[PDB]
Write an enzyme that holds these catalytic residues in place. Structure first.
Site, PDB file in Angstrom:
ATOM      1  N   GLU A  35       0.887  -1.609   0.082  1.00  0.00           N
ATOM      2  CA  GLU A  35      -0.347  -0.082   0.497  1.00  0.00           C
ATOM      3  C   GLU A  35       0.823   1.535  -0.090  1.00  0.00           C
ATOM      4  OE1 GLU A  35      -3.280   0.055  -0.118  1.00  0.00           O
ATOM      5  OE2 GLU A  35      -3.886  -1.229  -0.125  1.00  0.00           O
ATOM      6  N   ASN A  46      -7.628   9.788  -5.220  1.00  0.00           N
ATOM      7  CA  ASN A  46      -8.344   8.578  -5.973  1.00  0.00           C
ATOM      8  C   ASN A  46      -9.090   9.414  -7.483  1.00  0.00           C
ATOM      9  OD1 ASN A  46      -8.454   6.884  -3.332  1.00  0.00           O
ATOM     10  ND2 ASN A  46      -7.102   6.147  -5.053  1.00  0.00           N
ATOM     11  N   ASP A  48     -12.720   9.374  -7.474  1.00  0.00           N
ATOM     12  CA  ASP A  48     -13.744   9.484  -7.514  1.00  0.00           C
ATOM     13  C   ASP A  48     -13.323  10.965  -5.943  1.00  0.00           C
ATOM     14  OD1 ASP A  48     -12.703   8.627  -4.540  1.00  0.00           O
ATOM     15  OD2 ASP A  48     -14.168   7.469  -3.666  1.00  0.00           O
ATOM     16  N   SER A  50     -11.590  10.924  -3.824  1.00  0.00           N
ATOM     17  CA  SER A  50     -11.058  10.751  -2.272  1.00  0.00           C
ATOM     18  C   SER A  50      -9.833  11.178  -2.612  1.00  0.00           C
ATOM     19  CB  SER A  50     -11.737   9.515  -1.888  1.00  0.00           C
ATOM     20  OG  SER A  50     -11.397   8.574  -2.861  1.00  0.00           O
ATOM     21  N   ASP A  52      -5.986   8.400  -0.059  1.00  0.00           N
ATOM     22  CA  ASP A  52      -5.309   7.231   1.010  1.00  0.00           C
ATOM     23  C   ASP A  52      -4.524   7.738   1.146  1.00  0.00           C
ATOM     24  OD1 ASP A  52      -7.467   5.866  -0.481  1.00  0.00           O
ATOM     25  OD2 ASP A  52      -6.346   4.917  -1.712  1.00  0.00           O
ATOM     26  N   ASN A  59      -9.252   5.569   3.384  1.00  0.00           N
ATOM     27  CA  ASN A  59      -9.423   6.707   2.500  1.00  0.00           C
ATOM     28  C   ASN A  59     -10.529   7.953   2.637  1.00  0.00           C
ATOM     29  OD1 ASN A  59     -11.876   7.118   0.670  1.00  0.00           O
ATOM     30  ND2 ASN A  59      -9.803   6.665  -0.714  1.00  0.00           N
ATOM     31  N   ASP A 101     -15.477  -4.600   9.117  1.00  0.00           N
ATOM     32  CA  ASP A 101     -16.690  -3.998   9.245  1.00  0.00           C
ATOM     33  C   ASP A 101     -17.004  -4.744   8.267  1.00  0.00           C
ATOM     34  OD1 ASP A 101     -17.816  -1.891   8.619  1.00  0.00           O
ATOM     35  OD2 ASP A 101     -17.251  -1.566   6.729  1.00  0.00           O
TER      36      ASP A 101
END
Length: 129
Positions: A35, A46, A48, A50, A52, A59, A101
């Protein structure tokens, strides 16, 4: 801070990530390698809109607030820059909510693609833990 493979394994361990939700230490270290390359300062935007953040590339759409992701939910209740610190505590606490989650570590795309089903124990080999 750019961690060493074993240094990170040891801190993660000390932070209660080993076997956290059934995922051994090697899983967490492998996902961090892929990562962020073990760099707490890693950021990646990203499509979208957003971004990281940190060693675990958490995110801003869901987990943290960065002030520029419309509709962010801030589930970990923290500013995203907290995730970039040399002290991994907030990344860890947040990752623990994420992994709980539903989809487990599959939430981490590099984990799914590069770690999952591999001999992840290799990641902590030679370390003094």
């Amino acid at each position: 801070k750019v961690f060493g493979r074993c240094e990170l394994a040891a801190a993660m361990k000390r932070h209660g990530l080993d076997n956290y939700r059934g995922y051994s230490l090697g899983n967490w270290v492998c996902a961090a390698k892929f990562e962020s390359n073990f760099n707490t300062q890693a950021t990646n935007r990203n499509t979208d809109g957003s971004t990281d953040y940190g060693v675990l590339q958490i995110n801003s759409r869901w987990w943290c607030n960065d002030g520029r992701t419309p509709g962010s939910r801030n589930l970990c209740n923290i500013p995203c820059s907290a995730l970039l610190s040399s002290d991994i505590t907030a990344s860890v606490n947040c990752a623990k909510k994420i992994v709980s989650d539903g989809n487990g570590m599959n939430a981490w795309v590099a984990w799914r693609n590069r770690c999952k089903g591999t001999d992840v124990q290799a990641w902590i080999r030679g370390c003094r833990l």
